Write a protein that binds this ligand. Structure first.
Ligand SMILES: *[C@@H]1O[C@H](CO)[C@@H](O)[C@H](O)[C@H]1NC(C)=O
Lengths: 227, 215
């Protein structure tokens, strides 16, 4: 009946290091290896490294052989992961994992106990409100009575941002895409909607953007454009 | 190094249907070191099977793992709506562990070609020194979609990002955005901006384009 608790999410500058703690609650400490698994945004699971506490049996992933460091503090029964020289490839969620089931040490096991995960964001950005640009409807976004339009919510940090249409009255046909961390370290997303093309001259379309961390709120009206 | 590959990328199934996921190892390995994990919409991975075929505690009967040598499979016989997600195989033998790239099981649906829309950058953004060109693929199925940007018939590589919505709860379709980021100076040096979309629902690739300045 073991449970793993991990330290909270962090934003880290490129070139710096990140340390993530993991404490097993309700179990032993020097029997089973703690295997770390991370997950880059949208990418597959990736084993980082594993270490049997105190016993010293450990192995780092080949890609992290020179940047990774696994240790623990025995009096606090807490293991630690340190990853140095962070780049954008190291952004993701980091999971602390373990197998459950006199005394010995076992390293080669699947992981049925998973920590909640620690989100790591590698970015040099500070808290910043977004700029809201129109995705203007045109002939290049109309097709047989259906017009597509939207709003580009670009260059904010951190997540999240909320987007609604016409103060919530417009919900059908709305697609607000997941945010993406740009090469600058600032997030960006688009929210789109499809409407009857005949409504462009009669109906107003406003995207309501709210970035709570920066206290930034923008109501942007999307107007047609000759394209 | 032992590397694991998985097939297919996206396996489409309906409620009550049976499907098999494949995990191939680069070398011959002992079946005692293969595990399968399940990842749902928003939670941590969950161990389903270890030692290739030993089902984990509390894992329902629908999941059965088989295989030896290099070919290892995970079968879902009568899946329920809670089984839709991403499944990854793992090799935990030796000193270095590894995971497969993962396989997404999504709700099966009839083929639906994407509606393709393109948006120029706004004049407001151009003042800031940057330009974003957005290509929208709306309500398509299946998931596999190829989007290529062409700027004056020059293929763009490395200056576009794409984001996809989760499968819709109503019509089980996907929507995809592809955003091409260029500087202000580079954007004004060229005229024709096109996104070319390849998809099973399309008999031929669709090209949506515009001419800068005229747009
Ligand atoms: C695994 O063993 C089988 C049986 O000898 C052989 O046919 C196959 O080529 C081997 N593959 C690898 C990657 O060793």
């Amino acid at each position: 009946q073991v449970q793993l608790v991990q330290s909270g999410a962090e934003v880290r500058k490129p070139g710096s290091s990140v340390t993530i703690s993991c404490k097993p609650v309700g179990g032993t400490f020097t029997n089973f290896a703690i295997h770390w698994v991370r997950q880059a945004p949208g990418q597959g699971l990736e084993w980082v490294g594993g270490r049997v506490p105190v016993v010293g049996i450990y192995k780092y992933g080949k890609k992290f052989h020179d940047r990774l460091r696994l240790y623990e503090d025995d009096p606090m029964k807490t293991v630690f992961l340190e990853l140095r020289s962070l780049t954008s490839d190291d952004t993701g969620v980091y999971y602390c994992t373990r197998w459950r089931g006199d005394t010995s040490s076992y390293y080669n096991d699947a992981s049925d106990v998973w920590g909640p995960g620690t989100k790591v964001i590698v970015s040099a950005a500070s808290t910043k409100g977004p700029s809201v640009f129109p995705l203007a409807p045109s002939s290049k976004s109309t097709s047989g009575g259906t017009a597509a339009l939207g709003c580009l919510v670009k260059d904010y940090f951190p997540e999240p941002v909320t987007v609604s249409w016409n103060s919530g009255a417009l919900t059908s046909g709305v697609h607000t895409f997941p945010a993406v961390l740009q090469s600058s370290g600032l997030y960006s997303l688009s929210s789109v909607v499809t409407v009857p093309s005949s409504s462009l001259g009669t109906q107003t379309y406003i995207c309501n953007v709210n970035h709570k961390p920066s206290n930034t709120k923008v109501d942007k009206k999307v107007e047609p454009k000759s394209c | 190094e032992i590397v694991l590959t998985q097939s297919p990328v996206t396996l489409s199934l309906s409620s009550g249907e049976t499907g098999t996921l494949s995990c191939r190892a680069s070398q011959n390995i002992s079946s005692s070191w293969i595990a399968w994990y399940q990842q749902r919409r928003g939670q941590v991975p969950r161990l389903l099977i270890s030692a290739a075929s030993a089902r984990a505690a509390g894992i329902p009967d629908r999941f059965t793992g088989r295989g030896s040598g290099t070919d290892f499979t995970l079968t879902i016989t009568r899946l329920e709506p809670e089984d839709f997600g991403v499944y990854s195989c793992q090799y935990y033998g030796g000193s270095f562990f590894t995971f497969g790239p993962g396989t997404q099981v999504d709700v099966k649906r009839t083929v639906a070609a994407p509606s393709v829309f393109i948006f120029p950058p706004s004049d407001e953004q151009l003042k800031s020194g940057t330009a974003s060109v957005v290509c929208l693929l709306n309500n398509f199925y299946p998931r596999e979609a190829k989007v290529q940007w062409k700027v004056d018939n020059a293929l763009q590589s490395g200056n576009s990002q794409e984001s996809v919505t989760e499968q819709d709860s109503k019509d089980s379709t996907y929507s995809l955005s592809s955003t091409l980021t260029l500087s202000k100076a580079d954007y004004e040096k060229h005229k024709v901006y096109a996104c070319e979309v390849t998809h099973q629902g399309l008999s031929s690739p669709v090209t949506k384009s515009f001419n800068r300045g005229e747009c």
